[PDB]
Write a protein that binds this ligand. Structure first.
Ligand code: G2P
Ligand code: GTP
Ligand code: MG
Ligand code: MG
Lengths: 426, 428
């Protein structure tokens, strides 16, 4: 029960997917074949939430994959745990839509939604009951991800009761491969504010710094880069998959961290994060796991939380502990950092626990936060979007097989109207 | 023939219930299968060839906590039908867990209570464990109590409702759903044995000096208090005080029923070797602001009445001096109208505490209640929490999205406001 379906829109989502399902499957004790081999009989009691029981004592995911390019699909099924998929859910296209968002979201993807909506219409109705449509799409850069905005705007017509999560990878100027990240990222937000009920604004800028500073690695390889992004959301869903002294679902995080429906963006955080030698020199307690998350450096969102004050947060701890240590530390942080939290929301913080921590770690954690600080990111993209937009550039890809010039003003206006709401609370 | 039934609800009742029936299964001497190698009649039922099953009912729309029970060591004795599991929880949302999804389940749970009520000869009443912050543990009870009230209005429906602390409020919206239920509590129930979760951390960190507690250690404590209330109707005693007596003499007015709880002795095993635990000692260990488990200041308030449920080797003569002792105290006070507010229940049987627990195998024990005016300062915090944001109208669009209009929020608070003023009215 409380099923959840998982989609990959873009080259980011799939390498995220191949690791998303490599921690989870290994968190359930699973081989590349599909057959369970774990020793704990507990981790199957809600294996259903992701997987679907198939023949031969083999469980397999509901992993929908869309890129509009086979070159990425070939990476998945060939990689580790590439057999652990439904080849019906593998989906292809002709061209990658040219980093446009005008081809995918309108023309070259709309000729494909009928091939990926039917399977989720199939595979959502296949199960008993479900919680949401989560996915992993780069809000900027790759346009097969921005095409997913079509995929999210249509489920709201189908399943408006459910909640669609978005483990969205933001753009960032310090790390901007794609040149038109403001074009597709700014316009996609016009939909997610109206459609999505949650959004985890991961960003590659900070996410490197976590990989340099906290872990002290010579080079972030994408394989070693997403082992922490696979774990930052496994810790969100572990509260479903496993029994908690205090329990939570994707809807509880929503209602308890969303004062208003448009202010439903977030910044995640995972702890503990350690090197090899620098692991033995940490206490392995809730204070050690507490400061590891609230600190500005351990924040996938490319922002400075010291500026903007957290409206709401959540701390989905893991591993058997005492709730006092989980309570007083979340309570102490709310007092001393009174400015970084809000006055008119007493006890911003949540908690949540499990008795099954991830392999190798005897204790783990996870952080979520809706904060005013996201205005810095939205200012950062909109400050240069208007530059690329004033004295219009690249618009005939957006006029041909695209939209009118007024679409930009409505999105930019409603997107700038949004940032004022964050400014209202600081 | 003396009978009563437990209604565990939400995440709270189940986590309590796995540890609440951890006690009863050890009070009477029955394996966790159901077999017993009379007292048990009130909460068990002799069925089959030596298999006693509890008169419980568990309802958490989260299917997880019950699956821990259905898979746990107590999988056998609990009847699988009354172990309701639901499909998806209300996610700490009152209006969601009240009628939107709760209506799918009330049709089922009301059959088992009607199965047990018709199977039970005569009930003194019900008892329902729940928490406010659970949403589905709370709004479901808002719908359950009125069904049970209409179905059973004459019976007494007490509740050991968990209550959030002003500091450690584990949820974010539980300042909402708390006062929403208290508008419903006074209407239907007759005594809400409020308990705070942050207080017990201060109870256990200091008295039985546990460095870090789990809800297990917390729950094993609040099992003793409930068993101590119900030992009179469940065991022999020099002065039995069953469920129907103390609720009648503790509650002056039909709305003023919110007694804070207390238990003693609460001490570790190593520390119990030192104190003799005399009745004047443990009785005096009940009224200080520390040992109370609701996080209020009783010294600023005044007791109306109290009810002491002694256990173990106890004789009235030493408490007759105790009840005279506290009437001399001036820090402790009493409202003018009640001259004496000390019911004295005894049970020759000791607590028979749980194993693997922090508490000690003391040969004496005390529960204690008080329908004070000090409880008003508790929700004076929460009423401020609720009022400052409902003016801002934050977190309300979920409740509106689930069906509950905005009018109920203003009607629930003003009732608590009007309820609060009575404590200053009754006080003088
Ligand atoms: N978190 C990760 N982000 C990635 C990864 N690879 C690329 N990216 C980010 O994605 C953005 C580039 O878009 P894509 O990776 O989706 C390439 P794509 O095939 O989706 O282009 P389109 O065909 O135009 O959709 C860019 O901002 C990168 O920072 C990855 O392995 N992990
Ligand atoms: N006293 C006590 N309180 C508990 C226990 N377990 C959880 N709580 C408290 O219950 C309060 C409200 O949360 P819960 O009732 O657990 O939430 P829930 O019932 O899972 O809500 P749903 O997700 O809608 O089912 C929290 O503030 C917890 O501190 C327990 O064993 N004892
Ligand atoms: Mg591509
Ligand atoms: Mg629950």
């Amino acid at each position: 029960m409380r099923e959840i379906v998982h989609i990959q829109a873009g080259q980011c989502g799939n390498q995220i997917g191949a690791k998303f399902w490599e921690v989870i499957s290994d968190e359930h004790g699973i081989d590349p074949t599909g057959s369970y081999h774990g020793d704990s009989d507990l981790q199957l009691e809600r294996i259903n939430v992701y997987y679907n029981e198939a023949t031969g004592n083999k469980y397999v995911p509901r992993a929908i994959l869309v890129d509009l390019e086979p070159g990425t699909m070939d990476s998945v099924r060939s990689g580790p745990f590439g057999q652990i998929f439904r080849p019906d859910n593998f989906v292809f296209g002709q061209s990658g839509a040219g980093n446009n968002w005008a081809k995918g979201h309108y023309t070259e993807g709309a000729e494909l939604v009928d091939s990926v909506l039917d399977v989720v219409r199939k595979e959502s109705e296949s199960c008993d009951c479900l919680q949401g449509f989560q996915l992993t799409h780069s809000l900027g850069g790759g346009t097969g991800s921005g095409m997913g905005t079509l995929l999210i705007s249509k489920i709201r017509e189908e399943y408006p009761d459910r909640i669609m999560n978005t483990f969205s990878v933001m753009p960032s100027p310090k790390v901007s491969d794609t040149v038109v990240e403001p074009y597709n990222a700014t316009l996609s937000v016009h939909q997610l504010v109206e459609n999505t009920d949650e959004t985890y604004c991961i960003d590659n800028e900070a996410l490197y710094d976590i990989c340099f500073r906290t872990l002290k690695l010579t080079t972030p390889t994408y394989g070693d880069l997403n082992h922490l992004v696979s774990a930052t959301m496994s810790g969100v869903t572990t509260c479903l998959r496993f029994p908690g002294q205090l329990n939570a679902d994707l809807r509880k995080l929503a209602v308890n961290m969303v004062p208003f429906p448009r202010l439903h963006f977030f910044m995640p955080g995972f702890a503990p994060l350690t090197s090899r030698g620098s692991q033995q020199y940490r206490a392995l307690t809730v204070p050690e796991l507490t400061q590891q998350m609230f600190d500005s450096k351990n924040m996938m969102a490319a922002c400075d939380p010291r500026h903007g004050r957290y409206l709401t947060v959540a701390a989905i701890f893991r591993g058997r502990m005492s709730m006092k240590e989980v309570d007083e530390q979340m309570l102490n942080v709310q007092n001393k950092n009174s400015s970084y939290f809000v006055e008119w929301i007493p006890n911003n913080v949540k908690t949540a626990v499990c008795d099954i921590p991830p392999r190798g770690l005897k204790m783990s954690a996870t952080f979520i936060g809706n904060s005013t600080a996201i205005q810095e990111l939205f200012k950062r993209i909109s400050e240069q979007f208007t530059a690329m937009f004033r004295r219009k550039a690249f618009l005939h890809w957006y006029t041909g097989e695209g939209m009118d010039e007024m679409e930009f003003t409505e999105a930019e206006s409603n997107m700038n109207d949004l940032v004022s709401e964050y400014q209202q609370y600081q | 023939m003396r009978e009563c039934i437990s209604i565990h609800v939400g995440q709270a009742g189940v986590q309590i219930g796995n540890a609440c029936w951890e006690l009863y299964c050890l009070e009477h001497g029955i394996q966790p299968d159901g077999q017993m190698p009379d007292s048990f009649n009130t909460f068990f039922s002799e069925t089959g060839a030596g298999k006693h099953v509890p008169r419980a009912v568990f309802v958490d729309l989260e299917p997880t906590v019950i699956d821990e029970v259905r898979t746990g060591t107590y999988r056998q004795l609990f009847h699988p039908e009354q172990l309701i599991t639901g499909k998806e929880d209300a996610a700490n949302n009152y209006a969601r867990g009240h009628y939107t999804i709760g209506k799918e389940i009330i049709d089922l749970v009301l059959d088992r209570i009607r199965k047990l009520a018709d199977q039970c000869t005569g009930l003194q009443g019900f008892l329902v464990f729940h928490s406010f912050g659970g949403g589905t543990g709370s709004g479901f009870t808002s719908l359950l109590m009125e069904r049970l009230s209409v179905d059973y209005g004459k019976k007494s429906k007490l509740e050991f409702s968990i209550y959030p602390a002003p500091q450690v409020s584990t949820a974010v919206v539980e300042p909402y759903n708390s006062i929403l239920t208290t508008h419903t509590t006074l209407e239907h129930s007759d005594c809400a044995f409020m308990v705070d979760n942050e207080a017990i951390y201060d109870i256990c960190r200091r008295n039985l000096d546990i460095e870090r507690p789990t809800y297990t250690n917390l729950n094993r404590l609040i099992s003793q208090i409930v068993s101590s209330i119900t030992a009179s109707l469940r065991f022999d005693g020099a002065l039995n005080v069953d469920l129907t007596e103390f609720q009648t003499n503790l509650v002056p007015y039909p709305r003023i029923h919110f007694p804070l709880a207390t238990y003693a002795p609460v001490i570790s095993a190593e520390k119990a070797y030192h104190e003799q635990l005399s009745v004047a000692e443990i009785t005096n260990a009940c009224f200080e602001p520390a040992n109370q488990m609701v996080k209020c200041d009783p010294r600023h308030g005044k007791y109306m009445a109290c009810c002491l449920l002694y256990r173990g080797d106890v004789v009235p003569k030493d408490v007759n001096a105790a009840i005279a002792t506290i009437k001399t105290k001036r820090s402790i006070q009493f409202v003018d109208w009640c001259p004496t507010g000390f019911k004295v229940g005894i049970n020759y049987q000791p607590p028979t505490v749980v194993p693997g627990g922090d508490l000690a195998k003391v040969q004496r024990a005390v529960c204690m209640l008080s329908n004070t005016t000090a409880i008003a300062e508790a929700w004076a915090r929460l009423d401020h929490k609720f009022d400052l944001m409902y003016a801002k109208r934050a977190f309300v669009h979920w409740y509106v999205g689930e069906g509950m209009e905005e009018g109920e929020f203003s009607e629930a608070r003003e009732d608590m406001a009007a309820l609060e003023k009575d404590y200053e009215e009754v006080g003088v």
